[PDB]
Structure formats: C-alpha cells, structure tokens
Design a protein around this ligand. Structure first.
Ligand SMILES: CCCCCCCC/C=C\CCCCCCCC(=O)O[C@@H](COC(=O)CCCCCCCCCCCCCCC)COP(=O)([O-])OCC[N+](C)(C)C
Ligand SMILES: Nc1ncnc2c1ncn2[C@@H]1O[C@H](COP(=O)(O)OP(=O)(O)O)[C@@H](O)[C@H]1O
Ligand SMILES: Nc1ncnc2c1ncn2[C@@H]1O[C@H](COP(=O)(O)OP(=O)(O)O)[C@@H](O)[C@H]1O
Ligand code: VO4
Ligand code: VO4
Ligand SMILES: [Mg+2]
Ligand SMILES: [Mg+2]
Lengths: 574, 574
C-alpha cells in the first residue's frame, strides 16, 4: 500500500514526456485561483468605501470588472481542465498499452493457472477506473485545492489574528484525510478483486453456454452470480460508509474555525482594529471555504479508487515475463531437432511427465509419436516450441542448445496445428494468413487452402475467402475448422512442422487427400506428426512409441510390425 | 436517446420497492439544505446588530448555534447520502442480476454471431459506469440541487428587486445544461462500443494466445490494440472538451445576474431601503450559489454517462430471448425421436444445410451417423436438442413435437458430449456432476468416471477427484478432457445420449473399453452416435449415411456392406 503522493513519484517517469503540457495547466490553475480569490475579496470595497450618501465611486465601474474577471476565470479554467485531461488521457493510453503488451508476453505457465476473467478485468476495469479518476476527479481535486490555498492566503492577508486557528486546524484535517484515504484504497483493491470474480463468472457462463443449456446449469450459475454481485455491492457499501462518515466529521472540525473567529471577533478589544468590510469578508471567506473542502473530501473517494487501481497496475507491470534469455537469432533452420536425457515436470506437480527422452529428428524427414492417450505426446511438441522450459537435460536445434536462440527467432521456425484448434473472429483469409497478412498474396493463401482440401468447401460459402468465420469458427464444423488450421500451418515454409492430431475430426478420404498433399509438398521440410490413426503414419521415416512418458520403441513401420512389440498390439486392433 | 427524467420514469418500476430509504433520504436532504442556507443567512444578524452598531454586541450565542447547526447538517448529510447509496447499490445490483440472467437466456443463434468481448463489456464496463454515476455523482448532483433551491428561496425572501433576474437566467442555464447533456449521452454511448472493441481485442488475444506465439502475432495485435485504445482516448477527449466548454459558459451566464445585482444597488432613489446586512447577504448568496453551479455542471459528466449506460442496458433487457413456448412438461421421455421432411437453413445462409430428412430413433436402439466432414450431422444433434428451430418440418419426441415441450423440461431428456468440448475451471468432481452437484454423491461420480475409463488417470493426479482442472481443462490432455466429458454425459441417466465424436482423441483400446462399458447401458438407453471411426459403431442398430445434405443410405452394418453403396467405399478405406 503506497501513499497517494508515493504513487505519483512511482508514476512520474510515465508523465515526464508530457510535463511541457502541464506547466501551462499549472499556471492556468494558479490564475484561476487568483481570479476566484480576488472576486471574493470584491465584497470588501462595497461595504467600506462603496456605501455613502449618494456614493457610487467604485460601483460606477464595478460590475464590468466582475464580467471581465469572469471571462478570465472561464478561459483559464478551460485551458487548465483541457490540458490536464489531455495529459491524463495520454498517460492512461500508455499504461493500458503497456499492460496489454505485457500480459501478451507472459509465459504459458502463467496462462494455465489464471482465469480469463481476472485478466480481462485488469484490461477493462482497473484501467477504466484510472482513466475516470484521473480525468474527472483529478481536475476537481486540484481546482478545489487551488481555491482553498487562495482562501488561506487571503484570510491571512486581511487579518492574521482572526486566522491563527487555521494553523491548528490544518493538521487535523490532513490526518483525517490521510487515514480515510488509506481505507478508501484498501476497499478499492478488494472491490477490484470482486469485479475480477464477477467477470470471471460471466465469462465462464458465456464461454460454456451450450453446456449450461444442455445440463440445466440455470440455477447454479444464477446463484453464484448472485453471491458475487452481492459481495460487490457490500464492498461498495463499505466504501460509501467510509466516505459519508468522513465528510461530516471533517466539515464539523473545519467549523471550529468559524466558531473561533466569531468568538474572537466577539471581543470588542479585537474588532476595533478592523472595519466592517474586513470582518464580513473574513466571515464570508470562512463560510465559503467549507464548500471546496466538502467537495474535495467527497470526490476523494473516486480519486483514491483510481490511485489504488494505478498502484495495482504498477505492481502488475513489474512482474517477470517469459525468459527471453536467448541471444542468437536465425532466419531458417536446416530442419534437425535433437533431444538428450530431457526430463520435464509440469509446474505444480510431483511426478515428471517425461523421465528421459533421447528422441532425434533428422533433417528433412518425418517422425511420428504414436502411443497411449495419456503419455507425453503433446508435451514433446510444446517443448520443441519452448512453451515450457526443461527441468534438466539438453534439447538441441541445429547443434546449438534451444536456450541460446531468442524467442522470436525460434517460434518463427515452427508451424503448429494444435489438437485444440483455435480460430480468430475474422475472415477465412485472415485466419489462414494470421500474422503475415501483408506478406502473402491471395494466390498463396488459395494455394495453401487447396493443399489442405479446404478450397472444395470454401467455394460453397457465401463470399468465398471473404466470409466471416464467427467467434471461434463456430460457423464451421469441426472438420472444416481443422482444415483451416492445417492450411494456416502449411502456408508458411517453416522447416519444422508439428501436426498435433491434424486429422482427428476429418473422415478417411479427406485425410487421405491431406496426406497426399503433404507427401507431395513436405519432401524437404521436417515434420513431427502425432496421431492415433495408424494410417496417417505408416509412411513415417521412424515411428516412436511413448507410453507412461518414456520412449519404448523406435523404428520404421515394417521393423516395428515384425518386432511383435507394443506397436504390433496397437496395429493389430487398428 | 431519452432524457434524464425519461430515464428515471422508465427505471422507476425497478426502484419502487426501495422507497422508505428514498423518502427518509429526501427528508434529510431538505433538512440539510435548510441548515446550509441558514448558515449563510447568519451574516445579516451580525451586521445589522453586532459589529454594525456595536452598542448591542451582547450577541455571543452565534458560535454555539453555528456548531450545533453544523452538527445537524453533518448528521442529515450522512443519513441522506447513505440512504441514497443503499437504493443506488440495490438497483445497480438488480440490474446486474437481470442482465446476467437475461443474456444467459439468449438463443444460440445470437451467440453464434456476437463476440464474447462485447457481452463481457456489457456486464463489466457499462454496469460499473451505472454504479459509479449513481453512487458518487448522483448524491453530489442532488445535494447541489438542494443547495441551489435553498439559496433561491432565501434570496427571494430577502429582496426580489435584486433577484427577479434569476427568473430570467434559470431558463438559459437549463437550456445549456440540457443541450450539453444530450452530447454527453451521445459520446458515452459511443464510448461503450469503443470499450467493447477494446475488450474484444484483449479477449481474442488471451484465449488465442498460443496462435499469437507460434505465428508471431505480436506486432499485429499490438497495432490493433493501439488503434482501439487511441479511439477510446479520442472519444474521452471529445467528452472532456464538451464538459470544459460548457462549464465556463454556464458560469459566465450566471455572472450576468451578479453584475445586474451590483448595477441595481447603484440606484439610491429606488434601492434606498437596503440595510448594510441585507445587501451583503444577497451578494454572498450570489457567490455561494454560483459555486454549486460550477460543481454541478462539472459533475454532470459522470451522471450523464451513467444515464447513457442505464439507457443502453434497458434497451438490452427488453430484447427477444429464446422462444420457449408450449407448456407440456415431461418427467422422463421414452426417447423416441422422429423427423418429418425436415429442412433446416442456418441463420444467415441461403442454401439449406438439411433437406428432406426422414430419421427414426426408436427407444432402446442406437442410430449411427456417418459421412463426409461437412454433411449435416452435428446439425441433426443440435436440432434434436432444439438449439435451432426447424425451418419447415416436424420433429417428434415421445409422440409429440419438440415445439410444444418447454425447453427447460426438454434438455433434461438429452445428455450430449460434443466435439471441441468445453470444461469449467473447477474441480474434476464438479465438472463431472456439473449442475447437479448436491444430487449425485461421490460414489456415483466415481462410478461415472469408472464407466468412461477415466479412473486410471484421475486417480494418479495429486488430489484425485478434487484436483483443479484449470481454465477449459488445459491442465489435461485432449483424450483426458474427452474422457471427462464422456463421464459427465454418462453420469446422468437421461434416455437420449448423443455422442458427437465422443472418441475423437483416444487411442484404439481406450475407445474399445469405453464402447464396451457403454454397451451395458444400451439395453434401455436410446443413443445417437456420431463417429468417423467406423470400427466404433459396427454394432449400431441402424447406420445412417448422411452425404452433403440428404440421407443416402440406411440399415445395419451387414445390409450396407452387402449393398455395395457409399458405405462400402467408406469401409474399404479402413
Ligand atoms: C493545488 C495543488 C494540489 C492540491 C492538493 C495538495 C495541497 C492540499 C492543500 C490543502 O490544504 O487541502 C487539504 C489538505 O490536503 C491534505 O491534507 C493532503 C493529504 C495527503 C493525502 C490526500 C492527498 C490530497 C487528496 C485531495 C485540506 O486542508 P484544509 O482543510 O484547508 O486545512
Ligand atoms: N499444462 C499442464 N499442466 C499440468 N499437467 C499437464 C499439463 N498438460 C498435460 N499434463 C499432464 O501430462 C499428461 C500427458 O499430457 P500431454 O503429454 O500434455 O498430452 P498428451 O497426453 O495428449 O500427449 C496428462 O496426463 C496430464 O495430466
Ligand atoms: N452456427 C452455425 N451458423 C451457420 N452455419 C453453420 C453453423 N454451424 C454449422 N454451419 C454450417 O453447416 C454446415 C454443416 O456442417 P455440420 O453439419 O456442422 O458438419 P458436422 O455435422 O460434420 O459437424 C457447415 O458447412 C457449416 O458451414
Ligand atoms: O465435419 V465432422 O463434425 O463429420 O468432423
Ligand atoms: O494423448 V492425446 O489427449 O493427444 O490422444
Ligand atoms: Mg494431445
Ligand atoms: Mg460435427
């Protein structure tokens, strides 16, 4: 928990580029406060010198001065507000952009334990609270502070004897504001966590909607959301209770100043040194000082909430991202990947998921990983992509350990068809050519799609390649969204290709056409196809059988089949 | 785009139950306004008496009554603020609950075109805007309104020769506030869509993270989020420009009243009967009225934003939900299902996916759907669940149409495991027994896992049945996720079981084991098995071969094999 001025010194490097746009705002605020103070001091001359027997010596030129002062105040307030809001908007943009670009680079080990709801709350709630507090509440806070300091200097100018009490009452209000702002920040952080839970529940509902319908998850989801929204309301209630018990207390404490000055001025031995105008302007200033104080202490809730959000985001932005310890970069790999004594236990587990693998993938060939449905088959594919780091043992690419290569230059050498195919809500062309859209002409996209037996059914759609695919490609069947992932992978010429259950959903002749396409196209590029259909693999250069997490049998189709090993029992039952 | 009072009169039925709090808050607010007005009026008695003609300076009671009046003001302010925030929190919570329970009732046809980011924005951002405006800004707006009304009353009580101008200028200030509130609402309703785009971009980055990593979608996603955040900040700056160009103008308009008052005092022949205290309390009243104008017109941004958000949510809450007509509840259906010339055209297409389907699924039988990847078979599975409505044709179920059956009593007769199956971020037991957590005991869940061959891996994890499966079950392999989905489907004893590729990602012998265990239930169950592995369904009661959109072949295994039809070719490719 950082104090509300510690957060600004933690934020200053972000604001520093725009400090030129803040000097004008500060000068405008100073002039605004001066104009308001001089306008309130204008009550002095129309009771002392203004009133006389048929006397309008100042009143003849008075209201025009009020209009001019009002115009000055208006333009200064406008420029101050707009420039402060511009700086706030730029800073909020920078924080939001950096936050998004940060969680976009965290390791997958982090994504496997955090619900989507909390991160979406980070993007769309905390940043929004910071923006709202620093655009709407900050201007009010700083302007009322300027007005208050102006009233202070004015009351000390006219009569110090009637304003020594403010020296004794400033510390009390400072302590009260500090001790209530701490509570505001704590409640705001708990409130942020509760919003995270709310959006997590909402996203679990939305993403798993069909199962909610089919299994009758009506009442349970409704009750869970009821409880979480109730917690949200209760924490908001605690914040409101703090605010509404801190406003009147401070207002009453600030009213001892007015009570004292009335008590002090009640002494005829003191009022002699002053006139009616000075006394009435002191009383008016003390009376009208309470309004800025009340407004500041009331708006202090939103400003403190924004400061809490900024503190949380700065803590998040200071986390550790994926280990990009790599130094060397490479353009195209020759196509050979080697394992050595590699073992790898998943984050937060006891038994290793691989005990020791000595797999060797030759350059420009294919290696297939058949085996049971619970062994390490997708784990190997994740490892050769550096999704997870090894525990011990060496994994090599082109004779140099896989940790020397930087992350970008490595994954730019591998194309993957995940068993859980995920497609973006965009046209078919942009799903096939996801990141390198500008580098691949529609001719290349069409060739890649025709390779993956997808152009046959794309033509049937409304706009051909231009059709929108839906939120997750739900507009297409599983065997039409597992042939766009294949097309996307085949579009690139990455020498290392992984087919993590490429044809799980396809029928037999469609996958036969796929296999023909790869056999006529992948004659030079290394592939790592993993599948339980032992007909997409009978042409592999070396079949590898992994069960329980350890390699058991390595060899060609013929050498394994006549060996009467585990592959023989796997093949004899198709 | 409705006005503020129209918004409240549209919202009043929601607010109606919570009227005691509103009434007591209103009474306390009137008392607070009277107390605050009475504090400014004390400036007259101390000048007509007291320091003016100090011969009666015996008046000493003023500080005591000031302190007492401020205590009363503080108490009334606290109770009014708290009992308005109670109604605000209750109403916002009810809006959240109604909105969540509403979108969870949308038909699937709506979910197949709307990105989840926008709906999460509706729940998270918009509702938060309503809550913030109605909690923080609303109390400020109403308090300043009360203070303004009190100051009008007091000044008109004192002297109307110097106050009839406020009759003239109130319409002008009202016109300005209305014509700036319209722009605030429009900008806010654009800002909601922009934030929806922000959160859609964020969500499409998170839940498609691996596709971002593999293909280098780093810079593309960075550009997209930069553009959307820039649009957001630009709209925010437009809002702030409107606010800070409407505030000083309205402030200056009110200044023409003060200048006129100061012009009236210059004329003695008419305004000779002004006491030295009456005039100086009218002037202080103008100043202390013009301050709340600034405060109210400044805080009007948040309040108008909240009203725009409440309007947007009220547009959602009266949209069309799922049809759900007919009130024929059924206890436990026999399971018989029949089609009659069914023709189905998907929402937004122009060629019928299904046409002229005659399908019978008699009780205690299994019907197998086979064909190319792209024919309509998952469509049939969706139709018998009533995810979509028939375009033209009759379904039947236990001797009656699916339309007459109410939806809640229809999905209880179907347990469906689909392709791309979803799992909830919760313990494995709470995933198997999803919505009936407190009906199926632990031994029943264990039996369900045992039937689906899932006990061999579910018993090796660290915590057994209680291990957290993570978001979408990413902590488990594809085969294990499929097995848990099967175990979830099998735990229910629903008459109809639909297996949309229930064994896509399982090795051959676990497929054999599951089918062997599933064969026990076929004595009473009525299952619809969709599968491309023809060895899975060689024992189907009747096999239905669905090509592009029409049932081509049907019969048993041997009848189709002897017929030398399309099934013969599909089987030769084994
Ligand atoms: C301009 C420039 C900026 C204006 C704000 C800083 C100057 C405050 C001036 C001030 O006296 O106002 C307050 C002090 O304020 C505090 O006591 C600060 C306590 C720090 C925690 C809260 C930060 C201020 C948030 C908000 C009230 O002081 P007083 O009741 O008038 O005695
Ligand atoms: N992200 C993960 N975190 C923890 N454990 C995992 C994870 N992924 C897989 N496992 C464990 O490793 C075993 C094998 O999974 P994996 O090799 O990734 O998939 P597959 O079995 O399809 O090859 C599974 O039984 C599972 O319990
Ligand atoms: N939600 C949807 N909206 C519009 N069209 C769809 C939707 N789901 C599937 N389709 C279309 O219906 C056609 C039939 O596919 P489908 O019957 O789902 O294949 P399968 O039954 O093998 O999954 C597909 O070509 C697809 O384009
Ligand atoms: O398009 V399919 O659901 O038959 O893989
Ligand atoms: O071991 V698997 O879940 O890819 O069939
Ligand atoms: Mg896998
Ligand atoms: Mg399907």
């Amino acid at each position: 928990d950082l104090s509300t001025w510690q957060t600004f010194r933690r934020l200053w490097p972000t604001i520093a580029p725009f400090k030129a746009g803040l000097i004008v705002a500060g000068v405008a605020l100073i002039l605004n406060a001066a104009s308001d103070t001089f306008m309130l001091s204008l009550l002095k001359p129309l009771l002392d010198d203004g009133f006389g027997k048929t006397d309008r010596s100042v009143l003849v030129w008075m209201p025009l001065v009020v209009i001019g002062l009002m115009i000055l105040r208006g333009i200064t307030s406008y420029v101050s507000s707009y420039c402060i809001s511009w700086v706030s908007g730029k800073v909020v943009m920078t924080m939001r952009r950096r936050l998004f670009g940060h969680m976009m680079g965290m390791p997958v080990s982090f994504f496997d334990k955090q619900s989507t709801g909390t991160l979406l709350s980070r993007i769309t709630y905390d940043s929004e609270q910071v923006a709202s507090s620093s655009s709407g509440a900050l201007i009010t806070v700083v302007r009322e502070g300027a007005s208050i300091i102006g009233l202070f200097i004015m009351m000390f100018y006219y009569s110090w004897q009637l304003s020594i009490i403010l020296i004794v009452l400033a510390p009390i209000v400072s302590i009260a504001i500090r001790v209530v702002s701490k509570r505001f920040r704590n409640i705001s952080k708990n409130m942020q966590n509760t919003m995270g839970q709310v959006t997590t529940s909402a996203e679990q509902m939305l993403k798993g909607h069909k199962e909610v319908l089919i299994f009758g998850g009506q009442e349970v989801e409704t009750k869970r959301f009821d409880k979480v929204s109730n917690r949200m309301r209760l924490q908001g209630m605690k914040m409101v209770s703090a605010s509404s018990i801190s406003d009147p207390i401070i207002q009453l404490i600030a009213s001892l100043a007015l009570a004292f000055v009335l008590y002090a001025a009640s002494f005829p031995s003191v009022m002699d040194s002053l006139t009616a105008g000075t006394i009435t302007v002191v009383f008016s200033s003390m009376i009208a000082l309470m309004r800025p104080l009340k407004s500041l202490t009331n708006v202090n809730a939103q400003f403190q909430r924004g400061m809490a959000a900024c503190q949380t985001l700065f803590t998040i932005l200071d986390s550790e991202q994926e280990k990009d310890e790599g130094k060397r970069v490479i353009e195209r790999a020759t196509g050979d990947v080697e394992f050595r004594n590699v073992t790898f236990t998943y984050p937060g587990r006891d038994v290793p998921a691989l005990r020791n693998i000595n797999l060797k993938i030759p350059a420009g060939k294919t290696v297939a990983l058949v085996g049971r449905s619970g062994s390490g088959k997708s784990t190997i594919a994740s490892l050769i992509t550096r999704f997870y780091d090894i525990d011990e043992g060496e994994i090599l690419m082109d004779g140099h350990d896989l940790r020397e290569y930087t992350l970008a230059s490595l994954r730019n050498q591998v194309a993957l068809v995940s068993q859980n195919v995920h497609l973006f809500n965009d046209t078919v062309a942009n799903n096939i050519a996801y990141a390198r859209t500008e580098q691949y002409s529609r001719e290349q996209i069409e060739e890649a799609a025709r390779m993956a037996y997808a152009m046959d059914f794309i033509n049937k759609m409304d706009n051909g390649l231009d059709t929108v695919i839906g939120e997750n490609g739900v507009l297409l069947s599983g065997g039409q969204r597992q042939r766009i992932a294949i097309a996307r992978a085949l579009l690139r010429d990455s020498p290392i290709l992984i087919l993590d259950e490429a044809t799980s959903a396809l029928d037999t002749e469609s996958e036969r056409a796929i296999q023909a396409a790869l056999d006529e196209l992948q004659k030079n590029r290394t592939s790592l196809v993993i599948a339980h259909r032992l007909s997409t693999i009978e042409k592999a250069d070396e079949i590898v059988v992994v069960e329980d997490g350890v390699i058991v049998e390595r060899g060609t189709h013929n050498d394994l089949l006549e060996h009467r090993g585990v592959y023989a029992q796997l093949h004899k039952m198709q």
